């Protein structure tokens, strides 16, 4: 059971943007809207 | 900037289901699919 990113439709929402205060996907951080934001892992990252 | 629940379309995704490993909304925990799950707050809850 996963949430998928609205923009990156094949990516799982697995991180949290601490700057915007919104869960996001890895590609949103690598290339996308949160590229310069501080992020945290969601538990799924280290399970 | 917020993610909204797919089922509870007026609710913000502001909690994390630790049991299912998926971000969710409060109503999913109070009444919905994650009612018997263990949950955690997302940072937005205590900002
Ligand atoms: Zn994305
Ligand atoms: Zn951001
Ligand atoms: Zn919900
Ligand atoms: Zn659950």
Domain residue limits at A34 = 1-47
CATH of the domain at A22: 3.30.160.60
Tell me how crowded residue B40 is: count the other CB atoms within 10 A of its CB: 12
Distance CA A13, CA B16 (A): 12
Cα A27 versus chain centre, distance: 7
Total count of domains within chain B = 1
* Residues 1-47 of chain A whose Cβ lies under 8 A from any Cβ of chain B: 1-3, 13, 16, 18, 20-23, 40, 42-44, 47
Name the residue with tokens 């949290």: A16
Residues 6+ apart with CB under 8 A from A33: A7, A24
Q: How was this structure determined?
A: X-ray
């Amino acid at each position: 059971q996963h949430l998928m990113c609205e923009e990156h439709e094949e990516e799982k929402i697995n991180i949290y943007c601490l700057s915007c205060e919104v869960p996001t996907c890895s590609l949103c951080k690598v290339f996308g809207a949160h590229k310069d934001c501080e992020v945290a892992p969601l538990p799924t990252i280290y399970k």
